[PDB]
Write a protein that binds this ligand. Structure first.
Ligand code: DGD
Ligand code: CLA
Ligand code: CLA
Ligand code: CLA
Ligand code: CLA
Ligand code: CLA
Ligand code: SQD
Ligand code: LHG
Ligand code: BCR
Ligand code: BCR
Ligand code: STE
Ligand code: STE
Ligand code: STE
Lengths: 82, 38, 36, 341, 37, 505, 30, 33, 34, 34, 65, 32, 36, 30
């Protein structure tokens, strides 16, 4: 009733497994943290920061209204913030 | 003539061919290496 | 092979889940999404 | 025995996770649909398509995060990364709603891949393919709701967004605009889903309370062996019980398990038909006879007329924020309201 | 010419009759309101 | 004995009676066509193709005869309004009668094939068993299909030997049957270019002839024959159903979005023409031109053809109906009689106001009047006590240009609101509601009903494809799995390759 | 006529209940 | 109430036609046994 | 820009560290694979 | 005799590796202030 | 079974049941046409969708004149 | 023509009900 | 303990034709009076 | 609707003629 892979319970109770993964897991956790704390996640995805949903005296949503000028519309909205 | 969306179409076509061909190159190599024994 | 006893792996892993989830619930009351 | 057969051999190796030829379609598309949803709900806004925050990065929680539908102005654009709208700009693609088509399209092909997997494994193992046939019902639901329905409407914008509360909004939209509870195809779906859950509970309970004593332990689970030939519970006693309790009972184990396949699968198929109608706004919204009488006779009131007033409140009150591209401005004086509230 | 050998008897047992009538009667009960409209 | 859901399987190994059953089905379908046409002819009113076209009347097969060139009746009328015409034998009535005669002839042929089922043609010459060479049959039938497809494009659609097809201007004002030249360039794939429909049938028809010849002369590869069970007629059913549901999805989409093969004078406008104000923009364009060349408001709007104004009305939008609201659209808002004219609203200071139009999603919609800049200036209030924008307070008036009410102005607030409630539907029409006892509730057009039925059939045929495809590939275990199935064959690790007994360890 | 129709269909279902319980095909062991 | 008149004929045939089909099949089964 | 290396550095080091502790055992696997 | 790298190994890390990265990013988010 | 005049004429058309070409036969060539047809359907789809915009191809009713 | 509306259902049942009776009797005669 | 008085009933094909003919012709006669 | 009803009944009778003649119980010398 086995397909030849090493049993999971044998791996996670093994010392070598924990030698590797007590490094690999916190590193991945720290990398993900830095992705957010450096601000890179906002930039990659285009997600507004708390200060850049609206212009200062603006209460209108910057809604995309054109299919083929959409990219340019976003870009114009962004300029109007800076 | 050759419009921007036609270039993008070719970009998309080429990208899919690369993904499909690279995937099958790997699958064929592995299958040659690790054969079943009869 | 069977070095680290399984019941100790489960306890530490389980408390790690509790910590991460607890931090998400703390975050419901602080900063973004807290209504304040 | 050329390269095709050699590849066949490797795809069909008995391993922890069976691969198969179907795995070439299933595993990329399933991983990408799922990874697309986790990426979007963690990081991606809906500010430019909906005027909504929708990610953990923005302050949302698991109930309010979503991968939201594209803006109404995109129509039914495929929104390919390399297409004319985003023009290969990954960031603009996210902001324009591209993750939605990404997830819906890869999810669709992943569903195909999963049903082919059910066929593939069944053929290799030697069983009849009824699990694959039953899975046709989730497929009809997905394509009717996520693809056919928005394709009949003005744009993808009106498909469901992929999130807990976004789906809740979809339910309420369908009440107020389509009067979907009144639709007999949905009612047949309700009966199939609740009838299936009933059958599930009643069958599980019946087996567990007509067991044969096949061991001495108080835990009766231990007294079963997967290779035993004998039935582990008494069909005869189960039949007597239900005949005397309810009047009728199953007597054929094969019919019973087929009926358990039949009831929820048929129910889901019926609801899918109704959503196909709603793609065209072909609703069962009204009863004409009720409306003629109520227009003429202001003392005539039913639960039917009471619910339409509820639908009218929903529409007028949610439409401006829910359809922001329409620029609905409803002054306070036009909003329907009862006394005081 | 021989008689056709592909012919088969057809059956419907009493339980199937009860199930089918119940299906039809309940469907009629459901849809009749929409036919009268 | 056979369960009720399997009675027709007695035909699987009976090619003669299979043909008989298929003949009977073909008889029933042709007979329906004939009966449906006769019913539509007995109920069709041809007296006003402007405000009472066929698609307001619930006509379903009439548009399909018209699409391919049948346009007149033996009674002397034609659907384009021309009068005193002689269509020859191929009138609506003659098409109907041809289908009824065809149905009767197929019925007789079905009887003969059912009785004389044991034809030596159906027997394998080596083994004496009934057998159909499905690969070669496919090639023969494909060649035939290719010849017809080519002929239909080369002769019927071009007018080289035939009538052509329905074509029209972009706004559905001047449609007629016309011969169509092929479009061979990339615009031939434009769904709105009728020339591409001609080029498609010429090009695909030749490909079908070529592929037909291939499939007659070249046997299937052994690998493919065994993989697809080409000795089993049920594999053909499975793949024919897949082709058919695919085709059904395409014709549903092109009916809903519109194409050169679904013109708006035969099926009605699409919902998207309402969404994009397609007819209103054209109307405004013409009025602005009349105004540019110095015509007055009355003259500019009076020049607007009623047919164009009737397209700019939500009651002809196919997304405004209901599943159980039955019959022709005339049964709802009534039989349209006249365009009332274009309503212009103004407040007490003379600003022109614009009624906000009802979107298709909404069964009901408030009455909100805006200025050119979208600022709300008047409405019909729900709660009166804090109303700021009532017609009474804003002095809203309505004036009409063109149409029946041309040059009239109304100022009494209840009449002005009455027209404002109609204006959310677009252009305003006078309807006859008495003749049909119309109930006042919008119904959908033939474009809506056709799309609904074909999208629903396509989905259900998907399941048919899955069912019969499963039965084809799993024939050997249809009645159950092997009672001697080895537990080593389904347990893990016994075999290297799943289900392959030669890979034992 | 519609009240009569609804009640008629409902009455038929009740009568069917009676036959399905008291005139079922009896389950017979092995 | 101003109901669709054909609703009655539609309802009656909806019940009658498939019910009669089932009754036909059942009775001729019984006379086999 | 620089934030990409800050994000990528822990991953490279974790992959580096795993490659070290496992390399002798991966090499045996590739080999027994004839 | 057990292999280290398998199809299973790939599937596991395909899911587990971005999961931990994501938990790290969401954890940091709990300290963002408006 | 019954012989007929028409049956005798059509007889060779139903006489090669079970006959196959060996091995893979023309399967490679088939795959080439399938691949071409896919690309061709993609183009038709994306024109209709306005994802592929071609010069002088106005995917609109206004292409009737 | 202003005919009696119930005449359709009366005619329909006049045909269906006795016809179905005969068909039932005939088919069960054949199967025994 | 079955009832000894039960009998099978019969209708031959000729009687079906005759009976179907009676009903259809009666319907054809009275239908005009039903519509009135 | 009345025209359709008259013609429907008439058409069923012609169909009955066909079966009564060509699908009769054959008279056998018994
Ligand atoms: C179960 C099987 C399981 C297998 C599932 C596997 C999933 C495969 C992926 C599916 C791909 C589907 C995407 C099709 C996109 C589409 O449709 O996109 C829609 C476009 C049409 O584009 C729309 O067109 C509309 C109408 O426009 C027209 O009308 C306007 C008003 O006048 C203007 O004139 C304009 O110029 C003119 O083009 C609007 O403009 C919309 O904004 C625009 O999106 O059609 C096109 O791409 C092509 C449409 C024609 C072909 C129809 C294909 C059929 C598929 C849909 C069938 C369901 C139909 C639902 C009806 C209910
Ligand atoms: C089974 C695998 C699979 C499948 C079915 C899909 C399917 C899809 N993807 Mg996904 N994708 C996959 C794997 C897959 N993807 C992987 C592994 C990745 C990571 C690299 C992605 C990343 C990805 C992105 C980023 C996007 C998609 C998108 C899409 C959609 C459009 C694809 C398209 O137009 O193809 C067109 C291409 C083909 C059909 C290739 C066919 C090749 C033919 C047969 C031969 C051509 C020969 C060649 C051109 C000749 C070479 C020329 C050379 C000599 C010059 C579609 C739903 C898009 C989407 O979802 O938009 C909403 C999108 O933006 N995919
Ligand atoms: C008694 C209450 C009740 C019940 C039982 C139902 C039952 C149903 N409703 Mg109705 N609903 C109700 C009340 C109710 N409703 C009310 C009051 C309203 C307000 C009007 C609605 C509004 C409503 C709408 C608007 C819709 C329904 C739909 C449905 C159907 C959903 C079927 C289904 O499983 O979809 C679940 C979805 C699927 C099965 C799709 C495939 C899913 C794949 C397989 C998932 C794969 C997951 C992946 C592997 C892992 C993801 C993990 C990730 C989360 C981490 C079902 C018949 C839907 C419908 O009719 O569908 C046709 C629909 O669109 N309902
Ligand atoms: C110069 C030669 C020439 C020209 C000008 C044309 C011109 C045309 N062809 Mg033809 N064709 C030709 C040669 C040519 N053809 C040849 C040689 C062949 C090979 C035999 C074909 C095969 C062919 C096919 C198979 C089709 C056309 C179609 C068309 C039309 C395209 C516009 C349209 O409405 O597409 C609309 C159709 C599409 C955009 C295809 C969409 C396919 C969908 C996306 C597949 C998905 C199905 C799936 C089940 C989805 C269901 C669920 C979904 C709702 C989510 C147009 C009349 C199409 C047509 O007839 O449309 C009416 C069509 O389907 N042609
Ligand atoms: C593709 C098929 C099709 C389409 C699209 C149309 C379309 C149309 N017809 Mg035509 N017709 C058709 C087939 C079709 N017909 C056939 C086959 C017949 C012969 C019966 C007719 C006879 C006919 C007549 C006599 C008339 C029309 C009329 C009309 C128009 C109005 C239709 C209407 O109100 O629908 C109403 C539709 C519904 C109420 C929907 C019914 C669907 C039910 C609810 C489904 C049942 C569900 C099922 C039982 C669930 C069980 C499943 C479960 C057990 C698993 C419209 C243009 C009318 C018109 O205006 O003519 C001028 C008219 O008087 N038609
Ligand atoms: C060209 C299409 C086509 C053809 C030729 C067949 C042929 C067959 N089917 Mg398939 N099938 C199809 C489409 C088709 N099917 C589709 C679309 C579906 C999904 C709904 C199915 C689902 C299906 C199942 C689940 C089964 C079959 C079975 C069978 C076999 C026996 C059928 C029988 O005795 O019915 C007898 C049917 C009746 C006595 C009454 C049916 C009455 C229905 C419910 C309503 C009637 C509506 C009206 C008369 C027709 C409207 C036409 C409309 C489509 C335009 C036979 C080989 C059976 C099989 O495999 O047996 C081995 C089986 O179990 N079929
Ligand atoms: C932009 C392009 C994106 C796509 C690029 C292409 C990526 C697709 C390829 C991903 C597939 C990876 C699977 C192979 C990994 C592996 O280690 O197995 C092969 C090696 C170890 O295999 C062996 O493991 C075997 C068990 S099993 O086959 O892995 O199940 C065992 O038989 C053997 O002895 C052992 O050595
Ligand atoms: C808020 C928590 C919910 C309350 C927990 C109740 C679960 C009980 C199940 C009810 C189904 C009833 C239908 C009859 C079903 C019936 O016939 O069951 C029979 C089945 C086995 O019967 P045995 O006689 O073998 O049971 C052993 C007992 O007799 C004592 O050994 O019962 C159990 O397995 C009980 C296990 C409960 C022990 C663990 C508690 C459940 C934990 C998992 C769920 C936790 C909540 C999450
Ligand atoms: C989109 C895209 C893409 C892809 C991506 C991907 C693939 C991703 C993935 C992703 C991932 C893969 C992620 C993951 C994540 C996860 C998470 C985040 C999780 C969490 C969880 C939790 C939280 C849980 C917990 C719990 C609880 C709560 C309770 C109970 C217990 C438990 C423990 C379960 C690409 C590149 C192509 C590009 C394009 C775009
Ligand atoms: C023999 C003969 C003849 C005659 C013929 C005839 C007279 C015919 C008729 C035919 C006909 C006249 C037919 C008809 C048909 C019909 C049908 C075929 C129908 C169908 C229907 C259906 C199928 C429907 C269904 C449905 C319903 C009911 C409800 C809704 C839904 C649906 C749609 C599903 C002649 C003199 C020529 C010559 C000599 C021989
Ligand atoms: C038939 C199956 C094909 C599926 C293959 C999936 C396609 C792979 C998509 C990966 C392409 C991403 C490249 C995006 C390039 C955008 C840059 C640009 O437009 O200039
Ligand atoms: C399980 C652990 C639960 C976490 C508790 C966090 C709640 C803190 C909320 C607060 O700061 O008021
Ligand atoms: C090689 C010749 C190819 C073009 C021939 C047809 C040219 C006519 C072009 C058109 O009207 O579509």
């Amino acid at each position: 009733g086995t397909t030849g892979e090493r049993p999971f319970s044998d791996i996670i109770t093994s010392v070598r497994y924990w030698v590797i993964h007590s490094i690999t897991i916190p590193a991945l956790f720290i990398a993900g943290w830095l992705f957010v704390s450096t601000g890179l996640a906002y930039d990659v995805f285009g997600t507004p920061r708390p200060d850049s949903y609206y212009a200062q005296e603006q209460r209108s949503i910057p809604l995309v209204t054109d299919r083929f000028e959409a990219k340019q519309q976003v870009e114009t909205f962004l300029e109007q913030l800076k | 003539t050759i419009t921007p969306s036609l270039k993008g179409f070719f970009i998309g076509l080429l990208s899919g061919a690369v993904v499909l061909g690279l995937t099958f190159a790997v699958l064929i190599a592995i299958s040659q290496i690790d054969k079943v024994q009869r | 092979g069977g070095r680290i006893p399984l019941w100790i792996v489960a306890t530490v892993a389980g408390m790690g889940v509790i910590v991460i989830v607890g931090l998400f619930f703390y975050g419901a009351y602080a900063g973004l999404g807290s209504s304040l | 025995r050329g390269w095709f057969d050699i590849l066949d051999d490797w795809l069909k190796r008995d391993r922890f996770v069976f691969v198969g030829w179907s795995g070439i379609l299933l595993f990329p598309c399933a991983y990408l649909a799922l990874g697309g949803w986790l990426t979007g709900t963690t990081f991606v806004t809906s500010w430019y398509t909906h005027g909504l925050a929708s990610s953990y990065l923005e302050g949302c929680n698991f109930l309010t995060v979503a991968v939201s539908t594209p803006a109404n102005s995109m129509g039914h654009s495929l929104l390919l990364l390399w297409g004319p709208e985003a023009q290969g700009d990954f960031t603009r693609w996210c902001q324009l709603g591209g993750l939605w088509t990404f997830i819906a399209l890869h999810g669709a092909f992943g569903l195909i891949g999963f049903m082919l997997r059910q066929f593939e494994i069944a053929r290799l193992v030697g069983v009849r393919p009824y699990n694959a046939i039953a899975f046709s019902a989730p497929i009809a639901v997905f394509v009717s709701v996520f693809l056919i329905y928005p394709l009949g409407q003005s744009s993808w914008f009106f498909a469901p967004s992929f999130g807990v509360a976004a789906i809740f909004r979809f339910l309420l939209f369908f009440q107020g605009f389509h009067n979907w509870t009144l639709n007999p195809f949905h009612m047949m779906g309700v009966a199939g889903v609740l009838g299936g859950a009933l059958l599930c509970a009643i069958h599980g309970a019946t087996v567990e309370n007509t067991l044969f004593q096949d061991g001495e332990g108080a835990s009766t689970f231990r007294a079963f062996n997967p290779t035993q030939a004998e039935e582990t519970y008494s069909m005869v006693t189960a039949n007597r019980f239900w005949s005397q309790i309810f009047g009728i009972a199953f007597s054929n184990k094969r019919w019973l398990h087929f009926f358990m396949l039949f009831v929820p699968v048929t129910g889901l198929w019926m609801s899918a038909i109704g959503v196909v109608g709603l793609a065209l706004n072909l609703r069962s919204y009204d009863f004409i006879s009720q409306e003629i009488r109520a227009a003429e006779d202001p003392e005539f009131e039913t639960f039917y007329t009471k619910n339409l007033l509820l639908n009218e409140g929903i529409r007028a009150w949610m439409a401006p924020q829910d359809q922001p591209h329409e620029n609905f401005v409803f002054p306070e004086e036009v909003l329907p309201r009862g006394n005081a509230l | 010419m021989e008689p056709n050998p592909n012919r088969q008897p057809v059956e419907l047992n009493r339980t199937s009759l009860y199930l089918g009538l119940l299906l039809i009667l309940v469907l009629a009960l459901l849809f009749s309101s929409y036919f009268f409209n | 004995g056979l369960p009720w859901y399997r009675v027709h399987t007695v035909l699987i190994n009976d090619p003669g009676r299979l043909i008989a059953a298929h003949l009977m089905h073909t008889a029933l379908v042709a007979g329906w066509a004939g009966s449906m046409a006769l019913y539509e002819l007995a109920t069709f009113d041809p007296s006003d193709p402007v405000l009472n076209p066929m698609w307001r009347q619930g006509m379903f097969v009439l548009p399909f005869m018209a699409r391919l060139g049948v346009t007149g009746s033996w009674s002397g009328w034609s659907i384009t309004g021309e009068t005193g015409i002689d269509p020859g034998f191929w009138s609506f009535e003659g098409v109907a009668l041809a289908h009824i005669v065809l149905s009767g002839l197929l019925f007789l042929a079905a009887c003969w094939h059912w009785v004389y089922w044991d034809l030596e043609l159906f027997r394998d010459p080596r083994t004496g068993e009934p057998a159909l060479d499905l690969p070669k049959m496919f090639g023969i039938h494909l060649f035939l299909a290719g010849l017809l497809c080519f002929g239909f494009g080369a002769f019927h659609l071009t007018g080289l030997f035939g009538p052509g097809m329905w074509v029209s201007d972009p706004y559905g004002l001047t449609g007629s049957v016309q011969p169509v030249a092929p479009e061979w360039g990339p615009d031939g794939f434009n769904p709105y270019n009728p020339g591409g429909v001609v080029a498609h049938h010429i090009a695909a028809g030749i490909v079908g002839i070529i592929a037909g010849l291939f499939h007659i002369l070249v046997r299937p590869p052994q690998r493919l024959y065994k993989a697809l069970r080409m000795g089993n007629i049920e594999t053909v059913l499975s793949s024919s159903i897949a082709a058919v549901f695919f085709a059904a999805f395409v014709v549903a989409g092109t009916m809903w979005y519109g194409s050169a093969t679904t013109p708006i004078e035969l099926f009605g406008p699409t919902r998207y023409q309402w969404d994009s104000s397609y007819f209103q923009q054209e109307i405004n364009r013409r009025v602005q031109a009349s105004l540019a060349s110095g015509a007055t408001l009355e003259e500019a709007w009076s020049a607007i053809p009623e047919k164009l104004a009737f397209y700019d009305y939500i009651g002809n939008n196919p997304a405004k109906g209901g599943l159980f609201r039955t019959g022709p659209m005339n049964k709802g808002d009534g039989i349209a009689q006249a365009w009332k004219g274009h309503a212009v609203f103004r407040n007490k200071e003379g600003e022109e106001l614009f009624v906000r139009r009802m979107p298709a999603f909404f069964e009901s919609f408030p009455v909100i009047l805006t200025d050119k800049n979208g600022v709300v200036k008047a409405d019909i209030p729900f709660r009166r006590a804090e109303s700021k924008y009532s017609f009474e307070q804003q002095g809203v008036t309505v004036s009409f240009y063109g149409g029946e009410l041309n040059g009239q102005t109304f100022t009494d607030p209840p009449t002005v609101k009455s027209y404002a409630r109609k204006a959310i539907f677009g252009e305003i029409f006078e309807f006859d509601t008495e003749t049909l006892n119309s109930d006042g509730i919008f119904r959908t057009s033939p474009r809506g009903w056709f799309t609904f039925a074909h999208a629903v059939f396509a989905l259900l045929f998907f399941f048919g494809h899955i069912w019969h495809g499963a039965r084809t590939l799993f024939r050997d275990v249809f009645s159950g799995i092997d009672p001697e199935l080895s537990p080593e064959q389904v347990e893990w690790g016994f075999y290297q390759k799943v289900g392959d007994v030669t890979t034992r360890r | 006529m519609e009240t009569i129709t609804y009640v008629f269909i409902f009455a038929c279902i009740i009568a069917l209940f009676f036959f399905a319980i008291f005139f079922r095909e009896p389950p017979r062991i092995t | 109430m101003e109901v669709n008149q054909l609703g009655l004929i539609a309802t009656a045939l909806f019940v009658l036609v498939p019910s009669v089909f089932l009754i036909i099949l059942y009775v001729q089964t019984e006379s086999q046994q | 820009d620089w934030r990409v290396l800050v994000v990528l550095l822990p991953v490279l080091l974790a992959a580096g560290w795993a490659v070290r502790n496992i390399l002798p055992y991966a090499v045996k696997q590739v080999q027994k694979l004839l | 005799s057990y292999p280290i790298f398998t199809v299973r190994w790939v599937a596991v890390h395909t899911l587990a590796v971005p999961t931990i990265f994501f938990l790290g990013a969401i954890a940091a988010m709990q300290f963002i202030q408006r | 079974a019954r012989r007929t005049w028409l049956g005798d004429i059509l007889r060779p058309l139903n006489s090669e049941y079970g006959k196959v070409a060996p091995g893979w036969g023309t399967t490679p060539l088939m795959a080439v046409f399938m691949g071409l047809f896919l690309v061709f359907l993609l183009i038709i789809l994306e024109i209709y969708n306005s994802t592929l915009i071609l010069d002088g191809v106005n995917v609109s009713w206004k292409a009737l004149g």
